[PDB]
């Protein structure tokens, strides 16, 4: 608009500029064009100087001025959504009892948790996060997602008094287990809220179906609930943060990206993996084809606080590793000692929200973003530990993007577009390192309930997956920090392994991780590796050639 005309009046030193005038007749030049664009930025408008030069007249150029950042949508979005990779995986795997596949948490607030306040916060949090209203409709024999407006019954609400019952814990356990099973994916609330009142205060149970949440989305939901609760309890109208790009648009962009040349250029890598992974096979104590989830036992190992603190602060420096590189190199040695396999395929969950779509902002978007990608670890070269950590470290940077591309090629990309891929590496061992287990316990307005029991959000959530669903991963390994202790959890079917064989694996894990912490913390110098230098394609033999050669030049 006429902002741009006034900027020509300034930068071309001219008054009474006509609405039609031509930049070169006005005495303009490329030196004026850059200054015009450098002026519009102070109004948050972006214009290309190339467009200003090609279209030298006020109106032609004004038709191409854009805002310097995209405004993400504020409305109540609705309508169809394409199934993202992990959602299509979920409906593909066809669990028995799919409706009861949840995530949950129990909050606590010693000074009480007034019903109408939380109901009003729920009305807002579900209206604002345009994915917690999904419906899965099974039309035409496929499954098709529909995201719906203020059609009523956004969530299911219940309130109970437990103060009169002598066993509060068993009462809340029983009723939360009763809530989990009531999920309808078709035409019903995916969010179940239950308020339990207790002699020492009130508790909030949230259960949300896994198709619409993940760990980051729980951090979003807790901080937006805390802000809404504070706002309403003080008395002002509830004002949640600005909505980033809604899950519908993310799905549409992921459909449109799934066929681009950028993703398909990863095919030679995932081919080079799968063709090499084919015969890699985990031994079992018993051959049994499937097990229901009630067969999942688990067991835990804990590092002491002093060894945990060495891990988190000191041990990374000797190779510039991330925490995962050390936890995986320990898992590698643990499998090498326990199985005596030469090679192993481990599935890694990623946080999923990578910059795959250049315009996309997703940090405030709620949905199931988790990406699955396999990582083949060498166990052959395990002898010199110094050189095994470098090999494992390098694998994690060789992997394209952060593996988000693998699941898109498997479940979204068009079947003629993807070539040699032969997606036959099912999960056997799966790994995920959670950070601080503090997605919950990070605002003073409430805290993780003592009564949480089987309803936790992590791996030890007994209640949130159906007892009669199938075990889709043989070993599921998760780390977390609690009380400043690292706790590594091994979840396995008691029909596929005996307890003494997983106790071996978890003790052999603990010795090899303590070896890696000691090794990387006793090593005084720092040894960078080729992934640390900006040379695209550097290799160890070449990097030590150049570090001999600089020592001979200088």
């Amino acid at each position: 608009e006429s902002i741009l005309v006034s900027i020509w009046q300034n930068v071309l030193g001219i008054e009474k500029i006509g609405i039609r005038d031509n930049f070169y007749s006005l005495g303009g030049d490329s030196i004026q064009a850059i200054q015009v664009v450098a002026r519009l930025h102070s109004y948050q408008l972006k214009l290309e100087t190339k467009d200003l030069l090609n279209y030298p007249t006020i109106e032609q150029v004004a038709l191409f001025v854009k805002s310097t950042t995209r405004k993400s949508d504020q409305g109540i979005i609705a309508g169809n959504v394409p199934l993202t990779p992990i959602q299509k995986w979920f409906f593909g795997k066809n669990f028995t009892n799919t409706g009861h596949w949840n995530q949950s948490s129990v909050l606590y607030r010693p000074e009480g948790f007034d019903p109408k306040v939380i109901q009003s916060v729920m009305d807002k949090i579900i209206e604002h996060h345009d994915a917690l209203r999904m419906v899965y409709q099974h039309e035409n024999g496929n499954v098709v997602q529909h995201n719906r407006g203020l059609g009523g019954q956004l969530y299911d609400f219940f309130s109970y008094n437990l103060t009169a019952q002598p066993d509060v814990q068993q009462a809340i356990e029983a009723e939360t287990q009763r809530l989990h099973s009531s999920m309808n994916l078709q035409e019903g609330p995916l969010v179940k809220v239950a308020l339990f009142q207790t002699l020492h205060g009130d508790h909030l149970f949230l259960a949300i179906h896994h198709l619409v949440v993940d760990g980051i989305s729980w951090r979003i939901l807790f901080e937006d609930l805390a802000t809404g609760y504070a706002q309403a309890l003080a008395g002002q109208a509830i004002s949640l943060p600005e909505k980033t790009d809604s899950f519908q648009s993310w799905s549409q962009w992921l459909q449109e990206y799934a066929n681009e040349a950028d993703l398909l250029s990863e095919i030679p890598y995932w081919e080079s993996l799968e063709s090499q992974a084919k015969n890699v096979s985990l031994p079992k104590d018993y051959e049994v084809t499937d097990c229901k989830q009630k067969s999942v036992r688990n067991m835990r190992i804990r590092l002491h606080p002093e060894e945990t603190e060495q891990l988190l602060k000191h041990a990374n420096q000797a190779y510039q590793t991330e925490i995962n590189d050390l936890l995986l190199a320990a898992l590698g040695l643990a499998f090498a000692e326990w199985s005596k396999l030469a090679q192993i395929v481990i599935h890694l969950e990623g946080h999923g929200r990578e910059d795959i779509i250049e315009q996309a902002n997703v940090a405030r978007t709620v949905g199931w973003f988790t990406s699955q990608y396999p990582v083949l670890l060498d166990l052959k070269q395990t002898a010199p530990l110094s050189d095994y950590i470098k090999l494992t470290k390098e694998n994690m940077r060789k992997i394209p993007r952060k593996g988000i591309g693998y699941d898109i090629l498997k479940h979204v990309t068009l079947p003629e577009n993807r070539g040699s891929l032969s997606f036959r590496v099912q999960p056997e061992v799966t790994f995920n390192y959670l950070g601080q287990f503090d997605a919950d316990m990070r605002t003073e307005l409430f805290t993780r309930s003592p009564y949480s029991g089987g309803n936790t959000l992590g791996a030890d959530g007994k209640n949130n997956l159906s007892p009669e669903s199938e075990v889709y991963t043989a070993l599921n390994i998760t780390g977390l920090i609690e009380g400043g202790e690292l706790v590594l959890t091994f979840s396995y079917s008691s029909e596929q392994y005996r307890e003494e064989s997983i106790q071996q694996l978890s003790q052999s894990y603990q010795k090899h991780l303590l070896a890696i912490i000691a090794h990387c913390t006793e090593k005084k110098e720092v040894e960078r590796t080729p992934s640390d230098f900006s040379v695209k394609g550097l290799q160890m033999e070449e990097m030590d050639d150049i570090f001999e050669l600089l020592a001979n030049r200088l």
Binding site: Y24, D29, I31, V37, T49, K50, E527, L549, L550, R553
Partner: protein
């Protein structure tokens, strides 16, 4: 010592740094891979704080802590160190005497320009401070040309002063983050490199003729001796070019670049010219790039082209469109852009850089903004000049040009005239925007009046009479002398005159009026000379109906001429085909007719003579001449050269052509004796030698081709009588062999190499070299008496000496027109603007005025070869053929392939049986690659058109082993060369340029060789020859 901890990071070189590292390793013939900035700082700088602020600057920039590692790697790398302190040398000279200060300073500065930076060792900046006086500090910076362009210094010195103001006042820093050059790398990776190169491959499509500017001498050395010629346009003109730019809606830079294009169009002559613009290859698409330090500055082929009638406004817009379209792709390095051209490395040879903001008064501009202790009071810069000419332009209140020119290769008179022409273009274009690209004059009035001196010198007061009277006025002087002889029988001058009177009287009784035409179908015999002169005393146009020609073309000459009468002998009359009476010259009535003269009613302008020729158009052309044309030529020939009464002169040429019916009168009007060859003997060189022995012929006429041929009969030329004194020649672009130089020297021969196209007059320009060493391709000559030779452009405008253009011929030596298709007179003839009311004739010949004032020959414009850059002078190829002793007779011709693409070819006759590849190899020594014949055919004899020129249209077009995949010369060396090139197996000594290789592969090659062959071998070796065996001397 070094420990691994010191390296911050490592990077692949960007294409610009690849360019500079190629240069800095190959082009080590000189040491100036270096920029030097000299700054003066009046006031009171504090030496310690300024020394500190330079170290904070070096710690701040990763560029300044880069070292470039290249010697043995898979690929060159940047390596960045966390600390790399640059040398700062401080000198106090406050006590020194003023001449000793300025001496010691200038010595240090010159030594600093000469000391090289080792890219893998030395810190790639130097500083020295000189404390002159007590308040007059000076600083000298020098950096390697690989770090950053000169302009980046305006960023760096702003950082420096911000640091110094901080370190003095103790205030903490206000400097923003360094904008990372890796951001531009990721953008170079984002761009579709194929689509970019495809664009330039489309821009350079029609680029046949390579542009040049006139160079005093060949480029025998890369060592510069720079000079600067600087000049400005007046206020009234500099505001006018800005107004012209505003009205046509283009930038003033596009006005300046279009004016420079129009200059390069008038130099040369081509409507298609190209020169290097220099562009800040900083894409506006990237954040912070105007504060980003590195090599962004790049050169791109600016290319101006016009249509014939295009007005300056239309060209100015077409250039504007082209430069806006080019703007996306200007980040492509010139060495890639060169890869797409047919010319490769040779594409650009001068620059035109326009500077709205110089470094002075952008560095010096800071003054009022800060309380720093000093005022910066000059800055000077020295840079590696890469091109023999750079035109700087600074748009200001006066448009200040500066030619940075190599005084080794440009005469300062060339550069001065270049500046005068550049102003005269600007003057015309500014006074009226709508003028065409033709009819813009280049010339200042001094050179205009100098060129209009050539018409006025060589003027003459010759008597310009009617023609046959001049023979009369000679025959009266010595009638008894023998005038003409044929076989063994002759005429006296009296007999010739009387017999002409008889024929003329009889023709007049037969009704011949002087304006009429009469054919001369006659044998080269006594009767034929009498024929010509009798028809001429009847006044008529004596049509040269050559009896040897096929009857169809003779019938054309007869009918198209509508001739009433013909003079013949009997036996030829089988060739007559027309409703025409015919005077048998033997008839008894002519013998009974009076021998006395008859009263001349003739006038000097009357229709004198006619000719028909071979040609490119199908119909016979029908030239015509007037008596005044012979009068002027004859007086020039007789008074300014020699033919004499004692000379035995051959009419050595066939009667069908221009020279023959001038060499005749050239003998009679001087009083010599004409000998006629019995015309079968004209085909028998051995019998011509015998005839010249028998008759002692003293003056000769040789066709250009005949002169190429005769002296190869080396034993007959040794046997030749020493009576020869003058040779006359005609036909274009004579080739002189050193052998025939020897044979001219043996007899001190006056070779009159005349020239002139038959339609204006038979010759108009003259060269001779009686004792002096002869050029192997003799120049045209001087203009002769009462003629104006000119060189003009398509606007009929003059153009400066030493530059090529179309030859125009004017004066007394110009015919009336063509007899039929008479509007060809309008296509070929004009009234001379430069001698108002003199006739002028447009040749299509390309010609040039030379430094000594001779005219120089470049051939017919329709025939203009322009193969792959080069306006190839074909006579040089023929010269290197004919000077090769194993060749007798050889011819070079322009031929086209099945696409219509031009290629050079040769037709060769040998002295002896040999493998023809030997003479191809001899040319491969004697000639550049662009001018060796593409293929060769070998023959027994080469025929000719009857004018003596080779029948190139009749000669038949030509038609129509070193691989080493298992036959190594030395196994290791060739296998490595193959493994480096990778795209193909390689031949025994295969050629990297025929393989189309590139500089980046070359650096990878040498750096591979340095580790894999262990040869400490100069990269220059690979650019001298790609022949693999050269490494054998280095590895031993």
């Amino acid at each position: 010592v070094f420990s691994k901890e010191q390296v911050q990071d490592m990077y692949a070189l960007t294409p610009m740094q690849e360019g500079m590292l190629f240069h800095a390793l190959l082009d080590q013939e000189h040491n100036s891979h270096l920029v030097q900035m000299s700054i003066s700082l009046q006031g009171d700088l504090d030496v310690g704080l300024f020394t500190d602020s330079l170290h904070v600057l070096v710690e701040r920039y990763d560029v300044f802590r880069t070292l470039f590692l290249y010697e043995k790697l898979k690929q060159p790398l940047q390596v960045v160190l966390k600390q790399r302190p640059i040398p700062i040398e401080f000198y106090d000279l406050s006590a020194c005497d003023e001449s000793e200060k300025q001496l010691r300073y200038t010595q240090y500065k010159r030594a600093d320009q000469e000391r090289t930076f080792h890219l893998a060792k030395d810190p790639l900046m130097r500083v020295a401070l000189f404390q002159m006086s007590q308040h007059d500090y000076q600083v000298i910076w020098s950096f390697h040309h690989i770090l950053m362009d000169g302009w980046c210094f305006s960023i760096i010195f702003d950082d420096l002063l911000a640091i110094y103001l901080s370190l003095q006042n103790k205030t903490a820093l206000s400097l923003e983050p360094v904008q990372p050059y890796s951001r531009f790398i990721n953008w170079l990776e984002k761009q579709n490199k194929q689509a970019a190169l495809n664009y330039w491959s489309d821009y350079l499509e029609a680029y046949e003729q390579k542009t040049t500017l006139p160079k005093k001498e060949a480029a025998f050395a890369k060592a510069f001796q720079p000079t600067q010629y600087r000049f400005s346009l007046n206020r009234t003109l500099t505001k006018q070019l800005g107004t012209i730019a505003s009205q046509n809606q283009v930038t003033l830079s596009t006005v300046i670049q279009t004016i420079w294009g129009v200059l390069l169009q008038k130099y040369n002559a081509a409507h298609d010219v190209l020169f290097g613009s220099v562009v800040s290859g900083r894409p506006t698409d990237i954040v912070g790039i105007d504060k980003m330090v590195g090599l962004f500055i790049n050169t791109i082929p600016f290319r101006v082209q016009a249509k014939a009638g295009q007005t300056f406004s239309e060209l100015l817009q077409a250039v504007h469109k082209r430069t806006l379209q080019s703007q996306p792709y200007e980040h492509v390095p010139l060495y890639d852009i060169q890869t797409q051209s047919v010319l490769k490395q040779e594409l650009i040879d001068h620059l035109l850089v326009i500077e709205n903001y110089p470094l002075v008064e952008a560095l010096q501009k800071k003054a009022l903004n800060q309380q720093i202790g000093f005022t910066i009071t000059a800055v000077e810069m020295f840079e590696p000049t890469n091109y023999d000419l750079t035109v700087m332009v600074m748009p200001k209140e006066e448009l200040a040009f500066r030619f940075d020119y190599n005084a080794a290769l440009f005469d300062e008179q060339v550069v001065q005239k270049l500046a005068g022409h550049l102003q005269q273009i600007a003057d015309c274009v500014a006074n009226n925007s709508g003028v065409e690209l033709c009819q813009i004059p280049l010339l200042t009035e001094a050179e205009t009046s100098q060129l209009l001196a050539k018409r006025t010198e060589t003027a003459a007061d010759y008597p310009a009479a009617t023609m046959h009277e001049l023979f009369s006025r000679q025959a009266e002087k010595t009638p008894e002398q023998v005038a003409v002889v044929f076989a063994d029988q002759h005429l006296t001058y009296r007999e010739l005159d009387e017999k002409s009177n008889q024929l003329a009287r009889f023709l007049r009784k037969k009704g011949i009026g002087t304006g009429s035409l009469v054919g001369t179908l006659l044998d080269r015999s006594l009767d034929m000379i009498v024929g010509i002169l009798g028809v001429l005393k009847a006044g008529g146009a004596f049509v040269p109906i050559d009896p040897e020609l096929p009857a169809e073309r003779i019938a054309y000459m007869l009918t198209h001429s509508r001739v009433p009468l013909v003079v013949t002998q009997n036996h030829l009359r089988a060739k007559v085909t027309t409703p025409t009476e015919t005077i048998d010259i033997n008839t008894a009535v002519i013998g009974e007719e009076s021998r006395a003269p008859i009263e001349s009613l003739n006038q000097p302008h009357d229709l004198f003579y006619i000719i028909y020729t071979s040609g490119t158009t199908g119909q016979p052309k029908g030239v015509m001449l007037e008596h005044r044309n012979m009068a002027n030529l004859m007086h020039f020939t007789f008074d300014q050269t020699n033919i004499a009464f004692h000379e035995k002169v051959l009419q050595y040429t066939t009667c069908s052509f221009d020279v023959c019916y001038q060499e005749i009168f050239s003998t009679l009007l001087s009083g010599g004796q004409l000998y006629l060859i019995t015309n079968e003997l004209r085909r028998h060189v051995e019998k011509l030698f015998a005839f010249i022995q028998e008759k002692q012929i003293s003056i000769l006429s040789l066709p250009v081709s005949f002169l190429k041929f005769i002296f190869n009969e080396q034993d007959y030329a040794q046997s030749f009588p020493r009576c020869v004194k003058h040779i006359i020649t005609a036909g274009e672009q004579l080739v002189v062999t050193h052998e025939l130089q020897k044979y001219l020297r043996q007899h001190r021969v006056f070779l009159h190499n005349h020239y002139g196209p038959s339609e204006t007059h038979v010759v108009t320009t003259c060269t001779m070299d009686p004792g002096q060493a002869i050029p192997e391709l003799p120049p045209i000559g001087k203009p002769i008496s009462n003629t104006g030779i000119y060189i003009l452009d398509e606007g009929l405008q003059l153009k400066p000496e030493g530059i090529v253009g179309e030859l125009y011929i004017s004066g007394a030596n110009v015919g009336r027109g063509y007899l039929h298709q008479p509007e060809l007179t309008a296509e070929k003839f004009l009234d001379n603007p430069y001698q108002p009311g003199e006739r002028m004739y447009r040749t299509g010949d390309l010609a040039r005025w030379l430094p000594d004032g001779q005219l120089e020959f470049l051939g017919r414009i329709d025939h203009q070869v322009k193969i792959r850059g080069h306006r190839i002078e074909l006579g040089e190829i023929e010269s290197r053929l004919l000077n090769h002793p194993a060749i007798k007779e050889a011819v070079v011709i322009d031929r086209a392939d099945e696409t219509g693409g031009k290629f050079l070819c040769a037709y060769v006759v040998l002295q002896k049986a040999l493998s023809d590849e030997e003479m191809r190899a001899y040319l491969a020594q004697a000639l550049p690659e662009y001018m060796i014949p593409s293929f060769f055919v070998t023959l027994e004899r080469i025929p000719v058109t009857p004018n003596g020129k080779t029948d190139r249209r009749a000669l038949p077009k030509p038609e129509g082993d070193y691989v080493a995949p298992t036959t190594e010369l030395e196994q290791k060396l060739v296998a490595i060369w193959e493994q480096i090139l990778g795209v193909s197996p390689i031949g025994i000594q295969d050629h990297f340029f025929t393989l189309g290789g590139h500089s980046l592969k070359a650096i990878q090659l040498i750096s591979r060789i340095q580790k894999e062959c262990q040869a400490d071998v100069p990269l220059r070796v690979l650019f001298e020859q790609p022949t693999i065996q050269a490494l054998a001397a280095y590895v031993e």
